[PDB]
Subunit: 233 residues, 4 copies
């Protein structure tokens, strides 16, 4: 039904907003102030967007997040691909629109995710993994219909999880936690240096999060039947 | 019924508070610290006011927000006009009372919304549009009775949306997102320079937000019948 | 019943905690950083305490707040007096315990509420009034059983209202919004300079808040009968 | 049942995350900025983890917290021991993994809890006690099934309680409030100087919190029967 294309649209616009506001708030340099401010910006961007379209598409706005739900057998392979496609175009569009209204000199590299001189790509990949792992874990747990009438706003919980990822990570890798968010700055600045970290960390972390939740913490046992039936629809 | 004049009163007082506390917290200059602090101040002012009178008038406290609900066919043309009237007088009053208790030298221009030297009014109008668009989108989605028992506090969600608007926007336009909030400082400092941006951006953004929500994301299909019946009451 | 002395105890301990953590976090000087940090500290202290004992005593932890509920005919004159008595002793105790574990030199004046050189006591009284007014207004609205299943945490709403009061007020009067919180530092430092502001502003603001809510925004019509019956119990 | 080993696993992973992100965000020095940022980091780490596994193990992720529930007769002596065991190994593991991905020079002492030169260990023990006391009090009150449909997110309430503990405490003792969180940095840096404070304060505070809640504020009267029956299972 049209109850599918609306979601794809939700994922496109939300991703454009997420990157537009996220990157926009990161322009400049610096420091606690800097980190604190950028951590809150991405976090509140997500909390806002999750309230805005979480009921419509589940507000993934993140390829690694969508990948998590795929292996978690909660969405079809067809939906996953489109979500990720919409997320990549949306992100690029947000970065594009951001570039068009931002004064040069302040533009910098459009907040491209970058490693710290003293951090190896191996350590950086492990960082991005842990960041995305606690992040996806919070998403799965709070989206789980099987629990709590005392959750409060799941939109904010997830947003603050993203903020926590930044408060810690920015010092190491600028905190990617999202392939699409990393990709947009890279494709427009023509700089794919160390970009592998920002696809690998999140995907693996997202993978370990889903697995850890569904197959150990609070098992959601699906029969091989449904798995394929779902991965198909 | 009197269940109409109470709301108008709600919109008047809330607007006076919103501008009084919002502007008051913006006095001085500066920087992350500055932005972070002012972003939180406006955001918590709104979250507070939405809890205070959201059940009474819907706590619009914003002309662009009210305009959104008009074209969204959720209020009558009569209510909209009064809301906006109460919001403009309330704002001016808040700025007035703020001026009366604030020491000169610190008064400055009473936190008048201003463009960044390197930002064209065109880019500034597009910024204000995006700010108000994600803002109204969050308002519509969270006010929508058709969803979530996991929303948490809608008052805070909207407040944090406003904070996010500031964390990004202040650098560009000081972040207006609200004609009344922009108007009060302008009418009292007799400075309407670039004021057009602060009416145009929000109204258009607010317009694109409502449209995007009601006519694409989660359609609330009203028959031409009701539309006019509502725009009339 | 004992369902009365537990509350008095709740108000005593909560007040000791509120002042202990509130004042403790205010030691030193300074600035956004300073204000932001102290605003959040008092705010989260209250949100925490409101969750801790709001179900037991309503977590007033504030004389002006209790006064609001008295004139609001929601508590007896006997309860009000004891609450305020417990709040004053609790506060002093918190400031006392704070003094005993804090290094001198850092102690300063134990975060005594103070006016800004350029702010007259008249302007300062009006500031404290507005601060306490939006504060009590948020308390009444969120405590009102007659509304919302979308409130979220009322504990946090009220806490953030207090934070907003500080983000704006600290620059003017250090933000009292609470006679007991102002009193404790004064009685122990033997400095009652301008102390009148910190009793007068809140009480009046608290008074205008209750009146504004119960007699205009969302009238809670009590017959003269009940009023006295309540003010008596 | 396996509905026991999953919890132990929950407590292990959550503790590893808590310390990994908590300590990681504390690396460097400094100041409001520093404190504010670290306070929020620990706070959001907990809020995140409480949402992630609070429904599975109750998300204690803290020996003093678990001890509180033991004397509160809410868990068996067998569960308590394992929880604390999982929490200690998890913490050490988190600090270990943190060390492996962090650049030296920035590593410092891995955010080891430390006293302020002007604070005696006696004053420091009293500080840690008060910090953990308001903390456990908030945990008990918000976990109490006997109350509120207006709590909002208990995960966030507890997290913000931890943040408040840091906003005040870091200046005194770096804010331990958690034996496991203090232990991990100590065992790996081979520095147990003043470590006694970080086990004694929390345990006592946690003890006074439970007692204060269950035996005075909102008594949860258990017959000697059940107490032992519970402490046994
Ligand atoms: C879910 C997977 C979790 C993996 C946790 C691994 C912890 C050990 C990390 O060792 C680090 O490996 C880097 C190369 O990758 C080296 O450059 C670095 O010096 C070394 O300290
Ligand atoms: C599970 C599928 C994961 C796919 C991840 C794709 C990451 C994009 C690759 O970036 C690579 O970075 C290297 C430096 O590190 C560059 O030398 C190389 O030219 C560039 O292509
Ligand atoms: C919902 C409407 C969204 C519109 C998005 C428009 C993106 C392109 C913006 O282009 C900008 O236009 C400015 C004038 O307006 C020029 O001064 C500036 O140099 C140019 O880069
Ligand atoms: C949908 C209706 C929108 C109405 C918007 C009204 C905005 C107020 C106009 O401000 C204008 O700003 C110009 C500079 O930019 C000044 O030269 C001009 O004198 C001043 O009047
Ligand atoms: C609910 C009550 C609201 C009252 C609002 C009053 C607004 C006008 C404030 O005027 C101020 O009065 C001070 C003395 O009090 C003077 O020192 C100051 O120069 C003057 O500007
Ligand atoms: C509704 C009842 C309100 C009661 C308020 C009592 C406030 C305490 C008085 O402080 C006063 O401050 C003056 C300077 O301003 C000092 O000169 C004076 O000696 C001191 O006593
Ligand atoms: C739940 C228990 C609460 C206990 C509260 C105690 C408050 C009094 C603290 O006195 C302090 O004791 C320190 C040694 O411990 C001395 O070094 C310090 O100079 C002294 O001021
Ligand atoms: C309720 C049980 C509480 C157990 C608390 C154990 C705390 C660990 C002890 O740290 C101690 O710190 C001293 C300096 O202060 C060192 O001299 C001593 O060598 C070291 O062992």
């Amino acid at each position: 039904s049209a109850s599918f294309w609306r979601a794809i649209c939700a994922e496109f616009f939300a991703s454009l907003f997420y990157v537009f506001f996220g990157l926009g708030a990161s322009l400049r340099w610096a420091g606690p102030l800097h980190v604190l401010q950028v951590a809150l910006a991405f976090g509140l961007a997500l909390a806002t967007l999750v309230q805005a379209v979480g009921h419509i598409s589940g507000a993934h706005v993140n390829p690694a997040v969508t990948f998590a739900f795929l292996v978690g057998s909660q969405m079809s392979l067809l939906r996953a691909i489109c979500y990720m496609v919409a997320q990549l175009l949306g992100a690029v569009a947000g970065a594009a629109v951001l570039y068009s209204v931002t004064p040069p000199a302040v533009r910098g590299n459009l907040a491209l995710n970058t490693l710290h001189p003293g951090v190896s790509v191996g350590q950086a990949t492990i960082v991005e993994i842990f960041l995305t792992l606690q992040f996806v874990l919070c998403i799965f747990a709070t989206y789980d219909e099987r629990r709590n009438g005392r959750l409060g706003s799941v939109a904010l919980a997830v947003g603050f999880s993203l903020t926590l990822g930044h408060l810690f990570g920015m010092y190491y890798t600028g905190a990617g936690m999202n392939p699409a968010r990393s990709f947009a700055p890279a494709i427009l600045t023509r700089n794919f240096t160390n970009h592998w970290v920002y696809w690998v960390g999140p995907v693996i972390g997202a993978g370990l999060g889903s697995l850890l939740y569904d197959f150990l913490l609070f098992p959601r046992l699906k029969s091989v039947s449904e798995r394929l039936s779902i991965l198909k629809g």
